[PDB]
């Protein structure tokens, strides 16, 4: 009948517990040792300048008010005990719409070690913001950040730290790559301190370096542009007696280049500078227009 003794242990733990007070409120600064396991790097939405990422967000602090002494060493408790104790309020500084999964039960975990060391993991789907400088489109490379810190707890109260060597904290699964357009190169973590109007907060940062794949843009813009230019230069080998043929060549090539420019500019966000593909399409337009002008002069 271990159920009764373990119930008594749990009720002694929660007897006289205040979850509005962080562990070590008077004489200590709480130390939250975080960690991340990226189960799948979601598709980088280029239109919204966002990206999705599915993580196992792990945290672990030391609560001295949750020491016990029983037959077991680690209490692998249910996720509903995590709501009766104090848990840090980590928020993502750039997350847009994050969801915590509730299928079939809350995807959470809580292991109370016998010496008070807690462990609390969640399964999240963070939709963060990745500001992009599309000046080398489609040969660009980005560094999508993921900044998370504490809310309501300044640096004098809750300090964050990686749980392993900072190079080995953020781990990405091997098969976890939902990227069809980009190519994940590597992660890069860092820890800093941001000032504010309310206080000084600790901010942990993680950049995922990407590298766009040019195959699709080649196939659907650069080949049609080059082929249109060739089809336009075909109009020079026709004899000078066939005027309508060369006129059709010129006009249809100019129309094709116009529609190609339009369809090529639609894929990108409505950006207010010129990309590399834009320069290529402009030069091809100039070539076809010059071919038409040369025919007119002839």
């Amino acid at each position, epitope marked *: 009948d271990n159920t009764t003794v373990f119930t008594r242990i749990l009720d002694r733990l929660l007897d006289g517990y205040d979850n509005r007070l962080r562990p070590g409120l008077g004489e200590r600064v709480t130390e939250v040792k975080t960690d991340i396991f990226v189960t799948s790097f979601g598709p980088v939405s280029d239109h919204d300048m966002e990206y999705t990422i599915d993580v196992f967000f792990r945290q672990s602090w*030391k609560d001295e008010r949750l020491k016990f002494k029983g037959p077991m060493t680690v209490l692998r408790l249910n996720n509903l005990m995590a709501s009766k104790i104090w848990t840090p309020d980590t928020f993502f500084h750039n997350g847009k719409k994050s969801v915590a999964h509730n299928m079939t039960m809350p995807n959470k975990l809580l292991r109370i070690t016998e*010496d008070g*060391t807690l462990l609390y993991t969640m399964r999240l789907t963070v939709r963060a913001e990745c500001p992009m400088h599309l000046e080398d489109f489609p040969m660009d490379a980005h560094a999508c950040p993921l900044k998370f810190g504490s809310y309501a707890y300044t640096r004098a109260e809750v*300090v964050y*730290e*990686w749980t392993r*060597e*900072p*190079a*080995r904290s953020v781990v990405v699964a091997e098969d976890g790559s939902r990227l069809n357009q980009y190519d994940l190169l590597g992660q*890069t*973590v*860092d*820890s*800093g301190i941001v000032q504010s109007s309310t206080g000084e907060y600790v901010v942990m940062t993680t950049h995922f370096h990407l590298k766009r794949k040019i195959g699709y843009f080649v196939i659907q813009t650069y080949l049609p542009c080059i082929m249109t230019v060739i089809l336009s230069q075909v109009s020079f080998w026709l004899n000078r007696e066939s005027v309508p043929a060369r006129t059709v060549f010129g006009v249809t090539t100019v129309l094709t280049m116009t529609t190609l420019s339009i369809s090529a500019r639609n894929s990108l966000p409505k950006v207010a500078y010129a990309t590399a593909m834009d320069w290529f399409i402009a030069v091809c337009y100039a070539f076809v227009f010059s071919a038409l002008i040369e025919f007119a002069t002839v």
Partner: antibody
Amino acid sequence: VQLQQSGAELVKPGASVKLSCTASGFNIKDTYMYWVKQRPEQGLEWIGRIDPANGDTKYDPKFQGKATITTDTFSNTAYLQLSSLTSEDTAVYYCARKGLRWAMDYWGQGTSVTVST
Amino acid sequence: NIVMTQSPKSMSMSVGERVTLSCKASEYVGTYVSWYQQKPEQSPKLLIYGASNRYTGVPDRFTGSGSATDFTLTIGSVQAEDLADYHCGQSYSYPTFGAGTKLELK
């Protein structure tokens, strides 16, 4: 807060020395425990670390197999045992714990081992 | 393995003048570079944990300056007890220290 290492050792070449590092002022299960060597008038060098909560030990590639790092949670001690030693590793061995931003805030005092005949 | 090239090897400077030390990392180390001050016949003492954060008990004449790879330790009004080695060590990966700079008075 206060790390007490062992004393100096005078070991014959070809034997095994086991240096101890007793931590007083904290529990070793909370932090890591690094072992560093320093030959005379040279730079510091990393040997390996141990996570006393689990027992996961990592070593420098050039110290793999020669050294092993164990712990003792009852006495809050870290042990470094040099399995097979030549006459060249006559350095000073330090014991340190990781600090706030993964630095080594508290160092030991150094057990200067000596290999000769 | 990240290697830290610390410069210069040994400098000699008089009392009361500004001095600077450089530590260039090979790979990326975000701000996990620490500066230790080892006086002769003593154990190294942590000066700057992380880049530009003085440790408790360090005079305000020591300042760090961090980057991705290049790091700097500037001492201001240099006193007479600052004659010691100054090692720089990253911690972004498994810790690797620099060679150290023997500061001297002349």
